[PDB]
Amino acid sequence: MASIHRPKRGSLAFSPRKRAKSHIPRFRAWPEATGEPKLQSFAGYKVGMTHVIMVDDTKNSLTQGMEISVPVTVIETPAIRVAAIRAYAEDSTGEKAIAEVWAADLDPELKRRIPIPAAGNQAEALENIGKLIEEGRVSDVRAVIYTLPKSLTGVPKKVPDIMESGISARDLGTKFEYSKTILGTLVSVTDVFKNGTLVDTAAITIGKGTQGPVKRWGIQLMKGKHSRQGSLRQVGTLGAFNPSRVSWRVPQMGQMGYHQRTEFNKRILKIGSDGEEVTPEGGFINYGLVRGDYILIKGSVPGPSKRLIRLRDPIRAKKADLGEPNILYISRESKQG
Amino acid sequence: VIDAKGLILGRLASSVAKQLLSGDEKVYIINAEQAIISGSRAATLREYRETRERGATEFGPYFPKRPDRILKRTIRGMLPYKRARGRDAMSRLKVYVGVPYELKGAETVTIPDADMRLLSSSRYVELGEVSQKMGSKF
Amino acid sequence: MARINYSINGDPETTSKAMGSELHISPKKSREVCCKIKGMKASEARKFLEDVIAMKQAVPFKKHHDGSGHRKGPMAAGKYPISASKEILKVLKNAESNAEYKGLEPANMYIIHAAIQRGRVIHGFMPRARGRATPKDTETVNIEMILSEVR
RNA sequence: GGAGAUCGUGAGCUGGGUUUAGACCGUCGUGAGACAGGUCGGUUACUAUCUACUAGAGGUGCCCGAGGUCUGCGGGUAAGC
RNA sequence: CCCUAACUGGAGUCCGGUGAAGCUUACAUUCUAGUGCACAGUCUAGAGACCUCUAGGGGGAAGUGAAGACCCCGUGGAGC
RNA sequence: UGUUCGGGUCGAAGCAGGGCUGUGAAGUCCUGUGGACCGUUCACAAACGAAAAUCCUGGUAAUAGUAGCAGCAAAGCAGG
RNA sequence: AGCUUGUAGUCCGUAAGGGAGACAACCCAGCCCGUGGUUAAGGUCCCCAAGUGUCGACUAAGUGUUAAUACUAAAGGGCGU
RNA sequence: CCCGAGAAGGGAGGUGCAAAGUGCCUGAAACCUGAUAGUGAUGGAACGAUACGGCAUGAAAGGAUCUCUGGCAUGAAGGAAUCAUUCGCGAGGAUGUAGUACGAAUGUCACUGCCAGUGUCGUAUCUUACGUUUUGAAGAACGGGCCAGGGAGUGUAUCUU
Ligand SMILES: [K+]
Ligand SMILES: [Mg+2]
Ligand SMILES: [Mg+2]
Ligand SMILES: [Mg+2]
Ligand SMILES: [Mg+2]
Ligand SMILES: [Mg+2]
Ligand SMILES: [Mg+2]
Ligand SMILES: [Mg+2]
Ligand SMILES: [Mg+2]
Ligand SMILES: [Mg+2]
Ligand SMILES: [Mg+2]
């Protein structure tokens, strides 16, 4: 047989396409330190999309210097609390948690997620971690943070979301000193990210439930006379005669969306504090209005409105120093029009 | 507690499998990355990447990558491990990369007939080299 | 057509019995309900059956699971056998009355034996395509209930 | 580019061809009829038991009891060309 | 058709009631190769595999339906 | 069936399970159930022994609480 | 040609049991029941009972680790040894 | 008499040697419900045979020098260990110890309260069902869902033995 070729339907890079095991995205990799100590991640809540008119400052671009309309995603970024410091020991079998010290004073709504750690050992726990670092038992330190969505109104939840964040520093001792500085404090998104820089966004994508192969994998429909012979949105064949099985690579129905996805190189176009700057007339549809400080991310981000979006500094970014964007106009017209 | 440094993989595996089937002891094998496989490096690497990339994903062989897991698998093939006797033998075997902290300072032994200095040539590789060329972090 | 012996015979002194005689109900659903309520006190079994008949409480279906979805709460497949629950409740009421007649106290009795028995089938027919008539039978069920005041 | 997968794939499809019954042309035959010519027309059955896979649940095992955060034995990727 | 999308009603899905039939020697959670009447879930050697349930399209069970209507054979027929 | 010798309401045949003997076909005994018949010697008979025939008749499963109870006229609701 | 058709012997058919991974017909062996012993074929690193056996060499190719075998690649070449 | 809407049914209570309770004698199996024993959510498939174990049972019909555990005597085939000498390049061999100690079993004397059997599960070895068609059947050859019952060399005449 002489065959016509077609690229495979969909990607097998995200298999099995199951529901994400949590509503929070978990980062499997952390980039390398390139400066002073700081948290490598932040978490906000997706509000919605608008667009801005900005001067194209991207070097070498055809439209550089002129006004362009750029869609943006607005993400509310209230201050997160540094809840704990966790030390890790590296061995042959990988990293293991060796020590943890929780901040003495933690937010009362944290009880909705976990029973609150007491104001017990913080000086002695910190000195234990210092001894472990001095004796070489610690490979790196991470900060445990949680969001405080109670200050938001478009997000109905008051229970915090807890996640581990890396600390970027040149040395382990510097990491420990910085983490002890930030332990129990409220860190603002300006203390993590700067305007005009690239970040990676992770979220659980929009859930679509059970979907057929046409929507789930983008298989072709049956065409022409075949469209009305009774198998229109079904895969043509499940397999060959041999091997006598349906391969896992054959497109089939199943869960679509509500997966963890990471996007790369999403540029921060504005760090804002006044939520009236971005909230449209009539509010964001089904959300309401932004109240605290927010962030504008160029382009789209995974997840629907009100999902927790995790922001981390880029792991595969290419372009160097981009600059501060010159936003001439933020569209506040009705999204409901 | 057997020190696998400078030992032939198959001969050490045969010795340990017979000892486990003699059914009176728990065997610990340390420094599994330092075990030796005789033969040219190209041939051993070719055969181990052929075995590593063989099976089916839903069904097929899942050949390990860690040197300790590879050594346990090598012993696994010299046991009736689908049988109760073989399952008991595999439950009494622990293989380690380097020395685990608990076994640190314990008195070890070495199988004299599995020693790599009995080989007549320099055509050999260590198990750790195979594991790290298969992409295993250890 | 006639009366039936019980699979289990409890001692007459501290036990009451009842028999639902060839009810036109599902033997499978009634078997699941009997499996659920065996061992319970009579009062708690009555409350559970009332909740099932009111759709406030599902019975687990562990043997005849086909055609049942999973239910909310700590449960796999389960259903609401309304007809079986009503018939078994009538049998439970009869057994409690018999216990009262014996001088026993149904408030302190337990369902120690609750089993179904398939009775004689009434044979009907389902006319089918192409000149064929297939069965559609009236299955009857005997409900054996034994209450005892000790365990 | 070529080839394999029951010349992969009809309990997926199609039905143009071939491969029934009708008829025409040519040829053959005394004839009935025939042709490895051509031509026009010509019904595509089944509610999935097991297994396999795709997804979603309930358990039991491990386990102070519970919760949270992680690790990563492994599996996958073309995530790019 | 490129290339599909949204929407409407009926099914399906979930619940109550009612309630059949068809495949079935047995066992059975498989996968690869070989072997074997040369096309194996059961043999051989390996590789896998915790169980139960739900939904789903039909890869396999050389799936089920029908003592092949093609071919040959029968000192079997029938019509012409 | 002829013939010899018996057993049975103080419990025959049959049935369910078990002990013992016999290479075995089988026989015998025990417990329960059952309520009136049953064996045995030597011979003689036969409508005399079933796992199979897409066997026959009856009974009864899995399938399965599944398909169907939609498509051609989507019809019901309130109060009593 | 695991083709077809002869011939002698022997088998399977109708041949257990032991051994070759499995193997109608290849090797031991024809086999009443039970027990003990010693062997046959074949094997003795582990799976797996018994050798990590002895002597003398060769092979560097994981070649090989395959009595018969329908289950095992040639001509040609090699300052490889 | 009680429950039940009840001219259903159930319970209790009666009749009768016996419920045999009206399509009612006996009342098998398939099938279905429940109970008990064993096992069981890390597991490999002709569902068994054989051996050895765990758990349960072992009233009758089975054993009572029977079962258990030992001693002593005789013991066929077979037959060491250890040590000494000697041979061999070596692994080892030969000779002696030694046809000895032992050894299937056969007796005998003590000890013991189990054993046989049955069910289930486990470990070990072996076996890919059965009937048929076949040179060749586990076949991807045909037949059977299951159980019960029915189901196939007979008579007349004649010839031969
Ligand atoms: K192809
Ligand atoms: Mg009914
Ligand atoms: Mg009609
Ligand atoms: Mg097909
Ligand atoms: Mg002829
Ligand atoms: Mg029969
Ligand atoms: Mg021969
Ligand atoms: Mg024959
Ligand atoms: Mg012969
Ligand atoms: Mg043989
Ligand atoms: Mg019969």
Both tokens of C140, joined, read 């009857």
> Quick check: B125 CB within 7 A of strand G?
no
Say how far apart CA A307 and CA A300 lie, in whole Å.
13
Q: Of the candidates A30, A126, A27, A25, which has an alpha carbon nearest to the alpha carbon of residue A85?
A: A126
Give me A101's structure tokens. 């010290």
What was the resolution (in A) of this experimentally determined structure?
A: 2.4
What does the longest C-alpha to C-alpha distance in chain C come to? 62
Instruction: Indicate the DSSP class of residue C138.
Output: B
Contact A83, A185 (CB under 8 A): no
CA of A239 to C1' of D1 (A): 25
Say which residue the tokens 């229109």 belong to.
A232
Contact C111, C40 (CB under 8 A): yes
Tokens of B88: 């008991």
Give me A200's structure tokens. 């990676």
Give A149's contacts (C-beta < 8 A, 6+ positions apart).
A45, A78, A155, A157, A158, A159, A160, A161
Dist. CA A1 → ligand 1 center (Å) = 8
For chain C, the first-to-last Cα distance in angstroms comes to: 34
What does each C-alpha distance from A320 to A40, A41, A265, C130 come to in angstroms?
18, 20, 12, 79
With a 7 Å cutoff on the CB, does B19 touch strand G?
no
Burial of B37 (0-12, 13-18, 19+ CB in 10 A): buried
The chain B residues in contact with chain A (CB within 8 A) are 57-58, 96-98, 137-138
**Are B34 and B101 within 8 A, CB to CB?**
no
Per the listing, tokens 């007939």 go with B113
Rounded to whole angstroms, the Cα distance separating A10 from A252 reads 11
Q: In the 3-class helix/strand/coil scheme, how is chain A assigned residue by residue? A: CCCCCCCCCCCCCCCCCCCCCCCCCCCCCCCCCCCCCEECEEEEEEEEEEEEEEECCCCCCCCCCCEEEEEEEEEECCCEEEEEEEEEEEECCEEEEEEEEECCCCCHHHHHCCCCCCCCCCHHHHHHHHHHHHCCCCCEEEEEEECCHHHCCCCCCCCCCEEEEEEECCCHHHHHHHHHHHCCCEECHHHCCCCCCEEEEEEECCCCEEECHHHHCCCCCCCHHHHHCCCCCCCCCCCCCCCCCCCCCCCCCEEECCCEEEEEEEEEEEEECCHHHCCCCCCECCCECCCCCEEEEECCCCCCCCCEEEEECCCCCCCCCCCCCEEEEECCCCCCC
Spatial neighbors of B11 by CB under 8 A, at least 6 apart, are B111, B113, B114
∠ Cα A177 A167 A72 (to 5°): 140
Tokens of A234: 């079904």
Which residues, at least 6 apart from B10, have a Cβ–Cβ distance to it below 8 Å? B74
Distance B98 CA to D64 C1' (A): 33
Total length of chain B: 138
Q: Which two tokens stand for residue B127?
A: 């198990």
Smallest CA-to-CA distance from A26 within A189, A207, A164, A198 is with A164
Q: Which chain B residue shows the shortest CA-CA distance from A91?
A: B138
Which phi and psi angles does B23 have, rounded to 5°?
A: 60, 45
Cα C55 to Cα B6, C45, C80, C91, distances in angstroms: 72, 15, 6, 20
What are residue A209's DSSP bridge partners?
A: A256
- B105 CA distance to ligand 11 centroid (A)? 81
How far is ligand 8, taken at its centre, from the CA of residue A320, in Å? 88
> How far apart are the C-alpha atoms of C119 and C4, rounded to whole Å?
10
By C-alpha distance, the chain B residue nearest A246 is B58
Can you tell me the distance from the alpha carbon of A215 to that of A232, in angstroms, rounded to the nearest whole number?
13
Chain A residue numbers with beta carbons less than 8 Å from the beta carbon of B58 are: 245, 247-248
Q: At what angle do helices B9-21 and B67-76 cross, to 10 degrees?
A: 60
**Protein-proximal positions, strand D, CB < 7 A:** 2-9, 12-15, 52-59, 66-79
**Interatomic CA distance for residues A15 and A22, integer angstroms:** 17
Distance CA A50, CA A72 (A): 5
Burial C113-133 (b: 16+ CB within 10 A, else e): bbbbbebeeeeeeeeeeeeee
Among the partner-chain residues A92, A94, A248, the one whose CB lies closest to the CB of B58 is A248
User: Which residue type occupies C136?
Assistant: K
Burial A128-157 (b: 16+ CB within 10 A, else e): ebbebbeeebbebbbbbbbbbbbebbbbeb
Per DSSP bridges, beta strands B27-30 and B2-3 are parallel
Distance CA B29, CA B132 (A): 19
Q: Residues in chain A whose beta carbon is closer than 8 A to a beta carbon of chain B?
A: 92, 94, 245, 247-248
Closest nucleotide to the alpha carbon of B13, via C1': G46
For residues B51, B54, B60, B62, the Cα torsion angle rounded to the nearest 10 degrees is: 40
Residue B21 CB neighbours (<10 A)? 14
Match 């790290």 to its residue by tokens: B132
Instruction: Identify any residues that bridge with A45 across adjacent strands, giving them in sequence order.
Output: A76, A308
Picking from A77, A90, A79, A109, the residue whose alpha carbon sits closest to that of residue A201 is: A77
Interface contact B97-A92, CB threshold 8 A:
yes
Taking alpha carbons only, the member of B126, B97, B115, B113 closest to residue B39 is: B126
- State yes or no: cis peptide before C12, omega within 30 of 0: no
**CA A336 to CA B137: how far, in whole Å?**
54
Alpha carbons within 13 angstroms on the beta-carbon side of residue A23 total: 10
Tokens 């007339």 belong to A281
Pick from B5, B136, B8, B3: which is nearest to B74 by CA?
B8
Q: How far is A91 from chain B (nearest CA, A)?
A: 8
Judging contact as 3 or more Cβ pairs under 8 Å, the answer for C and A is no
Q: Are C59 and C32 in contact (CB under 8 A)?
A: yes
Instruction: Return d(Cα C81, Cα C90) in angstroms, integer.
Output: 14
Q: Are C142 and C119 in contact (CB under 8 A)?
A: yes
Say how many C-beta atoms besides its own lie within 10 A of residue A176's C-beta.
24
The residues whose Cβ lies within 5 A of ligand 1, an ion, are A 3
CA-nearest of C33, C31, C64 to C50 is C33
Chain B residues inside the 8 Å CB shell of A92: 96-98, 138
CA distance C30 to C32: 5
Which chain B positions have a beta carbon within 8 Å of A247's beta carbon? 58
User: C112, C39 in Cβ contact below 8 A?
Assistant: yes
Alpha-carbon gap, residue C133 to A169, rounded angstroms = 83
CB B117 within 8 A of CB B49: no
CA–CA gap between residue A72 and residue A238 (Å, rounded)? 42
In sequence order, the 6+-apart residues with CB closer than 8 A to the CB of A299 are A70, A71, A72, A73, A266, A267
Check CB contact under 8 Å for B98 and A92: yes
Residue of A nearest to B33 (CA): A92
Query: How many whole angstroms separate alpha carbon B116 and alpha carbon B130?
Result: 17
Coil, helix or strand for B29?
A: strand
